[PDB]
Write a protein that binds this ligand. Structure first.
Ligand SMILES: *[C@@H]1O[C@H](CO)[C@@H](O[C@@H]2O[C@H](CO)[C@@H](O[C@@H]3O[C@H](CO[C@H]4O[C@H](CO)[C@@H](O)[C@H](O[C@H]5O[C@H](CO)[C@@H](O)[C@H](O)[C@@H]5O[C@H]5O[C@H](CO)[C@@H](O)[C@H](O)[C@@H]5O)[C@@H]4O)[C@@H](O)[C@H](O[C@H]4O[C@H](CO)[C@@H](O)[C@H](O)[C@@H]4O[C@H]4O[C@H](CO)[C@@H](O)[C@H](O)[C@@H]4O)[C@@H]3O)[C@H](O)[C@H]2NC(C)=O)[C@H](O)[C@H]1NC(C)=O
Ligand SMILES: NS(=O)(=O)c1ccc(C(=O)N2C[C@H]3CN(C(=O)c4cnc(OC5CCOCC5)c(C5CC5)c4)C[C@@H]3C2)nc1
Ligand SMILES: [Ca+2]
Ligand SMILES: [Cl-]
Ligand code: NA
Ligand code: NA
Ligand SMILES: [Zn+2]
Length: 805
């Protein structure tokens, strides 16, 4: 109930929202049917349009007009944005040659440059190039400021998840807005686009920028506009706020555009109808810039032009129907469209089984256009599992397609020609970033980066300390002229032991056997120095990783590789080796097929044993440093040490073997040598963070050997590939992966073919950032290079996407 009987005189677009049932005059009041009776009349004036004309110049102030061309307008701060151009001989901002803004040029009384965030829904990254002829203001911002060729959204590439990620620096799984549509089982409530429940505060986790600003004494402009308030009025309101007295004037502002997303749904991303919305957005940017110029704020304000997701071609006829796969279709609820989320229609139904549902949806038709997953098996790069609002069963849908429950859903609701929501690595989902102003660089292109990084940067632009978030603070220092954030390396928590030869062969009772026999003073000092760390500079290129938690581990040196061996997990945490362009692949000799050798530096009690793998009918084992890449027949024995051994399902050995035998040598040829760091990951509670011992759900039968949920590899070389990995003078180049450790290859529909038909495709799907790996293992890589830390942070957030240009 609102007593909508008060008045909005002298209150239009008030900065604080008043408590019901007193009526409101803020920019959100319409969305709450709570505006005072006179709001439209006083606050939404439209008389005479949005632009001065020759004859309106000098006019007597008529307070009914939408904007003014009278003499006093400037001091009042309510001119039409084109006033000085029409009435005073001035040029449009877009017609001026750009000039570097070396320092803020701001009116007296401004304590910091203000920030304006200009958000555009569905602005696909390729519109910057393809629509450049019709967006002159946006192109001037792009080419004079700092820009990226595209910005990566979060999954799912929907509007609410992405806008709230921009505001908080958080993955959807952490901020809580995990879709445009949600069911929260703890609240027993639903969140929908239409309706009231989305206004409830309990949905919205983390700490968004406007709250971070307020708590630290920076005034924020009311960010959100009711949909019916036209774009022109939003611009004018912002310009008016910028004219307020210093003690009332906000330091940060938000403008949101429903376009081009709205049109893109109807017409497809490149429909000929798509030109006009793009023209209209550019005109709005022009109005803001002409407006700032009138107030002499155009070399004072930082402007961020940013999108939430792109847009792809999608029509009704490209729909897969769960009713063509499942007998029991009325027993399930589906969240449909460009992603699938399935749960039970009724929790009283004890005959609902996720396993049988997954099985009925797995590889059933030759060209099937979705793939079912348990959420914990989704690629780790999506970070889409650790939230009770995300259903256990998920369908990743092919780009260009939709999934629905029954044909009736589609034709009882072809309408649309564009949609979005797909995997965030898809090219058509990519969006835009441009930063322009005194704190940004001048005419600079930066490489693509993820939208989770911007919250940190907007805090920096405003002198705020960011709430804890998923950005890597400092990884975007290269966008900024000043205000950079200079972080320090995390301190190592555990130092390693360096064990020598301390045990005799006969003390091991592990049930392991090896055919090693036969043999000398030359090559005996030679093998001992290898075990003392003589080739370590060849294989440990960037320092050893630091262990950022309390644990007990050893450094182990060998001719071909170095490792950090965990006495708690009974296996390496990391194994590091270098494969040069010329290195040769050999094979495992026959006398060594089932060879496993005790490691005389590590006690029996801290070792794996072969008997457990024998007894475990499902589990087998593999090696972290691959025997195929040993540098000599004598070095090959090192690769069979029990301390190089890890648990592997036979199904996963098909993947691992192909990676080690074929792919490592391939990358070494293509990249001029590579450095590889490999190891296990344990994430049983699927939160994207390293498990402690008491979190491990599975061990090799009868033993304390814990089973990894994933295996990672970090493959590094020289960005200038004319130099070999081990003698690089400049920037590095990285790609990495987190492969799920699974007892079957159900994820790959073609896995009964040769590994050369499906393995590399699986790895690409599970591409990762070094930073994803750090979270999952508690390690910190690249501790000793010649590069600056900021540059290393950038490299650690890099993702190799394998999309085309
Ligand atoms: C991305 O960045 C984010 C932000 O940095 C990272 O997430 C953080 O991870 C921290 C470590 O897991 C976590 O710290 C915990 O805080 C608990 C208190 O949490 C409240 O306070 C914070 C801060 O104000 C607040 O933001 C939280 O809000 C969450 O919960 C509500 C839902 O009710 C949501 O509105 C909100 O969106 C958010 O949800 C998300 O987080 C929770 C986890 O907290 C998830 O479960 C959700 O799915 C969702 O993702 C909270 O209001 C604190 O209680 C924890 O302490 C426990 O564990 C420690 C270990 O040190 C132990 O010492 C304690 O005893 C305690 O255990 C007790 O509780 C157990 C569980 O009930 C119980 O079993 C035990 O026996 C004990 O009794 C913990 O310190 C921090 O909250 C989140 N922050 C956010 C915003 O998510 C994230 O890790 C990053 N991701 C990656 C990949 O790096
Ligand atoms: N495109 S789609 O997914 O089909 C789809 C679905 C619903 C809608 C829709 O009705 N709408 C109506 C729109 C009103 N709106 C907003 O006011 C808002 C504007 N800024 C925002 O973020 C910040 C602003 C500051 O800097 C960083 C980003 C947010 C955040 C969620 C809180 C919210 C966004 C709503 C989606 N639009 C598109
Ligand atoms: Ca975990
Ligand atoms: Cl959704
Ligand atoms: Na076995
Ligand atoms: Na398969
Ligand atoms: Zn949309």
């Amino acid at each position: 109930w609102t007593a909508t009987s008060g008045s909005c005189k002298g209150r239009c677009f008030e900065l604080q929202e008043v408590g019901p049932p007193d009526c409101r005059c803020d920019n959100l009041c319409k969305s709450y049917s709570s505006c005072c009776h006179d709001f439209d009349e006083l606050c939404l004036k439209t008389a005479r349009g949005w632009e001065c004309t020759k004859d309106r110049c000098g006019e007597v102030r008529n307070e009914e007009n939408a904007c003014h061309c009278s003499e006093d307008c400037l001091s009042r701060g309510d001119c039409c944005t084109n006033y000085q151009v029409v009435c005073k001989g001035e040029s449009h901002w877009v017609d001026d040659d750009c000039e570097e803004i070396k320092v803020p040029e701001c009116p007296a009384g401004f304590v910091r440059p203000p920030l304006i965030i200009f958000s555009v829904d569905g602005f696909r990254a390729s519109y910057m190039k393809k629509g450049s002829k019709v967006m002159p203001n946006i192109e001037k911002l792009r080419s004079c400021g700092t820009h990226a060729p595209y910005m990566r959204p979060v999954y799912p590439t929907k509007t609410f998840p992405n806008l709230y990620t921009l505001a908080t620096g958080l993955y959807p799984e952490s901020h809580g807005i995990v879709g445009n549509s949600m069911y929260d089982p703890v609240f027993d409530a639903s969140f929908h686009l239409r309706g009231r429940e989305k206004f409830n505060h309990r949905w919205w986790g983390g700490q968004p920028l406007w709250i971070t600003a307020t708590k630290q004494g920076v005034r924020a402009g009311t960010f959100f506009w009711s949909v019916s308030i036209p774009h022109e009025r939003r611009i004018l309101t912002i310009l008016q706020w910028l004219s307020l007295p210093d003690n009332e004037r906000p330091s940060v502002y938000a403008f949101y555009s429903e376009q081009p997303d709205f049109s893109g749904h109807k017409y497809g991303p490149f429909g000929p109808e798509m030109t006009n919305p793009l023209r209209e957005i550019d005109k709005t940017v022009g109005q803001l810039m002409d407006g700032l110029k009138q107030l002499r704020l155009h070399r004072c304000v930082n402007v961020i032009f940013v999108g939430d997701h792109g847009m792809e071609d999608v029509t009704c006829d490209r729909t897969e129907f769960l009713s063509n796969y499942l007998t029991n279709v009325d027993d399930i609820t589906l969240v449909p469209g460009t992603l699938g989320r399935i749960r039970a229609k009724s929790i009283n139904n004890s005959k609902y089984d996720p396993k049988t549902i997954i099985a009925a949806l797995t590889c059933k038709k030759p060209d099937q256009h979705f793939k079912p997953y348990m959420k914990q098996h989704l690629p780790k790069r999506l970070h889409y599992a650790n939230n009770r609002r995300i259903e256990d069963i998920h369908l990743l849908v092919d780009r260009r397609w939709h999934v629905a429950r029954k044909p009736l859903d589609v034709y009882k609701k072809c309408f649309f020609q564009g949609d979005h929501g797909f995997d965030n690595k898809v090219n058509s989902m990519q969006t835009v970033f441009v930063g322009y102003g005194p704190t940004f660089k001048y005419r600079t292109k930066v490489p693509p980066f993820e939208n989770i990084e911007l919250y940190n940067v907007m805090c920096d632009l405003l002198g705020l300390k960011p709430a804890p978030n998923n950005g890597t603070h400092g990884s975007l220092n290269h966008l900024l002229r000043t205000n950079t954030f200079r972080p320090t390396m995390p301190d190592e928590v555990s130092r390693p032991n360096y064990p020598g030869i301390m045990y005799l062969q006969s003390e091991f009772d592990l049930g392991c056997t090896c055919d090693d026999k036969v043999e000398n003073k030359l090559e005996e000092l030679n093998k001992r120095l290898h075990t003392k760390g003589s080739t370590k500079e060849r294989h440990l290129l960037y320092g050893r990783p630091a262990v950022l938690y309390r644990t007990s581990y050893d450094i182990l040196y060998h001719t071909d590789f170095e490792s950090g061996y965990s006495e708690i997990f009974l296996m390496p945490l990391w194994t590091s080796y270098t494969i040069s362009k010329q290195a040769e692949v050999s094979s495992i000799p026959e006398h060594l097929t089932n060879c496993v050798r005790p490691d005389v530096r590590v006690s029996p009690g801290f070792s794996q044993n072969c008997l457990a793998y024998k007894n475990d009918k499902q589990m087998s084992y593999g090696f972290l440093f691959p025997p195929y890449l040993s540098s000599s027949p004598e070095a090959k024995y090192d690769a069979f040490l029990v301390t190089n051994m890890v648990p592997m399902y036979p199904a996963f050995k098909r993947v691992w073997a192909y990676f080690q035998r074929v792919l490592v040598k391939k990358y070494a040829s293509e990249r001029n040598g590579v450095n590889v760091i490999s190891g296990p990951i344990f994430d049983y509670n699927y939160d994207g963070l390293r498990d402690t011992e008491d979190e491990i759900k599975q061990y090799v039968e009868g033993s304390s050997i814990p089973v990894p949920t994933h295996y990672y590899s970090i493959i590094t070389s020289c960005l200038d590939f004319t130099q070999p990995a081990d003698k690089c003078d400049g920037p590095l180049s990285v790609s990495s992966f987190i492969l799920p450790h699974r007892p079957d290859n159900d994820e790959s529909c073609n896995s009964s073919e040769d590994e050369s038909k499906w393995v590399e495709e699986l790895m690409k799907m599970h591409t990762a950032r070094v930073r994803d790996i750090e979270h999952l293992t508690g390690l910190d890589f690249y501790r000793k290079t010649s590069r600056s830390y900021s540059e290393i942070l950038t490299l650690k957030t890099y993702l190799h996407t394998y999309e085309s240009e």
